[PDB]
Amino acid sequence: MKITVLVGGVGGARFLLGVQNLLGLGSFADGPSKHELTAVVNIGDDAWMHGVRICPDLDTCMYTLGGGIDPDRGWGHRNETWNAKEELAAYGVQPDWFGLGDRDLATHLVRSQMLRAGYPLSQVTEALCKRWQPGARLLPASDERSETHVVITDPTDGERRAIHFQEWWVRYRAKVPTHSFAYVGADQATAGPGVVEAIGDADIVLLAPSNPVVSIGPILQIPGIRGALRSTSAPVIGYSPIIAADECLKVIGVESTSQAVGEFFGARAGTGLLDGWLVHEGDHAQIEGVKVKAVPLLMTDPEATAAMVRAGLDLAGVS
Amino acid sequence: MKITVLVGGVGGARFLLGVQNLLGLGSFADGPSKHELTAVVNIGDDAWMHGVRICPDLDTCMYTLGGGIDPDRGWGHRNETWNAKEELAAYGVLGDRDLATHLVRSQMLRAGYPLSQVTEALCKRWQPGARLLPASDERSETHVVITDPTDGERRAIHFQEWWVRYRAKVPTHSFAYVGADQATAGPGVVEAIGDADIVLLAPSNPVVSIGPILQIPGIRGALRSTSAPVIGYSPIIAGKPLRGMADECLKVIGVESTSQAVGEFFGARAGTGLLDGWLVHEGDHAQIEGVKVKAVPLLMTDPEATAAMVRAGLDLAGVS
Numbered sequence: 001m002k003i004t005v006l007v008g009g010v011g012g013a014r015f016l017l018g019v020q021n022l023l024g025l026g027s028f029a030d031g032p033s034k035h036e037l038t039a040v041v042n043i044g045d046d047a048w049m050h051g052v053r054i055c056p057d058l059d060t061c062m063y064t065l066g067g068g069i070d071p072d073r074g075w076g077h078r079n080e081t082w083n084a085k086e087e088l089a090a091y092g093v094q095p096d097w098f099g100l101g102d103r104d105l106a107t108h109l110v111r112s113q114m115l116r117a118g119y120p121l122s123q124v125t126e127a128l129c130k131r132w133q134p135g136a137r138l139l140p141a142s143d144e145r146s147e148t149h150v151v152i153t154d155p156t157d158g159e160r161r162a163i164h165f166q167e168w169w170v171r172y173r174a175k176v177p178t179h180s181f182a183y184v185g186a187d188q189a190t191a192g193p194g195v196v197e198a199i200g201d202a203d204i205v206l207l208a209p210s211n212p213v214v215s216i217g218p219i220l221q222i223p224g225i226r227g228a229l230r231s232t233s234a235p236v237i238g239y240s241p242i243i244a245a246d247e248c249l250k251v252i253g254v255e256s257t258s259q260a261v262g263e264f265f266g267a268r269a270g271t272g273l274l275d276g277w278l279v280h281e282g283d284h285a286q287i288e289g290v291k292v293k294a295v296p297l298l299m300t301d302p303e304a305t306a307a308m309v310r311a312g313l314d315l316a317g318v319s
Numbered sequence: 320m321k322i323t324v325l326v327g328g329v330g331g332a333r334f335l336l337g338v339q340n341l342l343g344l345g346s347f348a349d350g351p352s353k354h355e356l357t358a359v360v361n362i363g364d365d366a367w368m369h370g371v372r373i374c375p376d377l378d379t380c381m382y383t384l385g386g387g388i389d390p391d392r393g394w395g396h397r398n399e400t401w402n403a404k405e406e407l408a409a410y411g412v413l414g415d416r417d418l419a420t421h422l423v424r425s426q427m428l429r430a431g432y433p434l435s436q437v438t439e440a441l442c443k444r445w446q447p448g449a450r451l452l453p454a455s456d457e458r459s460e461t462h463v464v465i466t467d468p469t470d471g472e473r474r475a476i477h478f479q480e481w482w483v484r485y486r487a488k489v490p491t492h493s494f495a496y497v498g499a500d501q502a503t504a505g506p507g508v509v510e511a512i513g514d515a516d517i518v519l520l521a522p523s524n525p526v527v528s529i530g531p532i533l534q535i536p537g538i539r540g541a542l543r544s545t546s547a548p549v550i551g552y553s554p555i556i557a558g559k560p561l562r563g564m565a566d567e568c569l570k571v572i573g574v575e576s577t578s579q580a581v582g583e584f585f586g587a588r589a590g591t592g593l594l595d596g597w598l599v600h601e602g603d604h605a606q607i608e609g610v611k612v613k614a615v616p617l618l619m620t621d622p623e624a625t626a627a628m629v630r631a632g633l634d635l636a637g638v639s
């Protein structure tokens with residue numbers, strides 16, 4: 001009936017596809033729907049760039065579930081052109097390191113016009129989703145600003161500087177000496193409309209195998225959201241993103257193992273979040289209070305991920 | 320060595336090229352010129368659209384004098400795409416290269432820069448070889464008052480919406496210059512009109528291209544008082560197949576599409592009007608009391624023919 005998933009990045013979007021294929025939602029609708037998919041989507045990477053508002057995780061989910069995503073980039077449109085970006089370069093304006101594709105820009109333009117006219121992000125997203133018809137509710141973790149910053153040592157002058165996550169990841173490639181993460185605005189952000197209720201009324205809550213520190217983690221920094229998870233009746237099942245990201249675990253000093261990431265989220269039995277923790281084939285993890293089972297955890301295609309989604313329901317004991 | 324031109328539309332940009340060709344400015348420069356071209360540019364078609372500020376006449380002048388216009392289409396960039404517009408259409412609500420200009424312009428305006436300075440910043444890239452002064456740094460947007468067919472009410476529509484959607488489809492009652500009364504003349508505009516050796520009104524549409532410049536407080540007063548001669552060019556070209564058609568915007572204000580009527584619209588400086596001279600196309604006549612009228616070729620076939628057109632205006636004014 002009702003399943004809620006926390007997501008970020010391309011992995012979160014690909015996980016949602018697996019849920020949809022499993023329950024006949026969205027593009028995979030084969031007859032009358034009998035379940036509802038709700039995604040709580042990271043806003044930590046959102047940024048104003050060139051006077052327009054970029055919501056990468058919401059867009060990636062919207063584009064992916066709607067059949068518009070670039071299969072080889074994982075972000076932005078299929079058949080994208082970059083003529084507006086080329087002309088911005090010809091004007092010599094900055095930032096020159098962030099790619100605003102022509103098709104993509106229409107999304108940013110409509111979004112920005114609505115937000116400046118007072119529409120909250122949740123409403124903008126549903127307005128944009130009417131065109132894409134993703135077959136899932138894409139809820140921004142908040143309608144208020146909550147942006148992940150990165151504290152680095154700047155290589156041009158050796159000075160400490162905070163840069164938005166986008167500049168750290170897209171411009172520096174996570175290649176600069178990096179000291180910590182800051183979730184600027186998280187404590188002052190309210191849980192987005194429907195977010196607490198979606199976590200509270202779910203039959204199960206799933207954590208997509210997205211980046212733990214900078215995709216899922218920032219969702220968990222919104223005060224209302226972490227409490228909903230601790231207080232909800234539904235089982236909470238996490239998927240480990242460690243199959244062998246590594247850069248962001250290092251910054252907060254956590255090992256890059258399914259065991260360490262499991263204890264990063266922690267056990268509901270204690271002060272933590274998880275009731276179950278699924279890890280990849282051949283991987284072993286043990287958390288007291290957390291049901292751990294090793295299963296195939298590679299999102300090869302919507303069919304393989306659907307099995308991944310099933311593995312979580314089975315461990316949660318939910319039908 | 321100082322010539323000021325009021326301009327709007329594609330005709331205004333083509334006229335500026337002729338001035339540049341005559342005085343060796345911009346693209347037609349050989350060695351450093353000793354003349355200065357200043358354009359006073361209509362802002363009446365400017366609009367916020369899709370959250371960005373679109374300024375059509377300033378951009379047309381900037382792209383044209385900067386050599387960025389597509390020679391075989393005559394409008395817009397070379398190698399222009401319309402993919403963002405395609406997606407805007409799919410969303411149910413504007414060239415891709417064009418959008419870059421709007422993105423840069425809007426960021427500057429929202430950061431406190433006035434339109435005059437925004438224009439100077441964009442011109443560093445285009446280098447049009449002319450000073451492009453917005454008629455005002457305040458909003459003054461030309462609307463058209465229609466009878467709306469959903470409810471039969473008078474409604475003001477932005478001229479650009481009227482032009483594609485409502486023109487010739489519903490009763491059209493008047494023009495309104497929204498914001499004009501609260502607008503001041505743009506920086507350097509009054510001084511450009513006052514210090515010129517000659518002021519030219521390009522053969523743009525008189526009501527909605529030149530006309531709205533004249534609604535900006537201060538600009539009409541500068542025109543009446545300047546010591547420079549004021550020479551207007553008629554936009555009426557007779558001899559077309561089927562005798563052409565009447566200008567639709569002149570029709571809204573019930574003015575005939577003749578060089579005589581457009582001349583009387585601007586009127587004579589000797590009276591309450593604006594012209595010292597009025598050039599009409601060969602084979603055409605106008606007689607207005609106080610106004611020197613001469614028929615000469617008035618087709619902007621190429622910068623060379625436009626250069627001759629500009630030369631005739633200096634000759635009519637008696638300015639070297």
Ligand SMILES: O=c1nc2n(C[C@H](O)[C@H](O)[C@H](O)CO)c3cc(O)ccc3cc-2c(=O)[nH]1
Nearest residue numbers: 009045054055056059075097098099100170
């Ligand atoms: O590495 C890049 N990632 C780009 N991304 C992806 C984005 O960086 C994501 O924030 C991270 O890739 C992690 O999700 C975009 C996402 C959008 O919604 C819109 C535009 C972009 C542009 C880029 C880009 O130019 N380079």
Ligand SMILES: [Ca+2]
Nearest residue numbers: 144188189190
């Ligand atoms: Ca707040």
Ligand SMILES: [Ca+2]
Nearest residue numbers: 469470471472
């Ligand atoms: Ca009525």
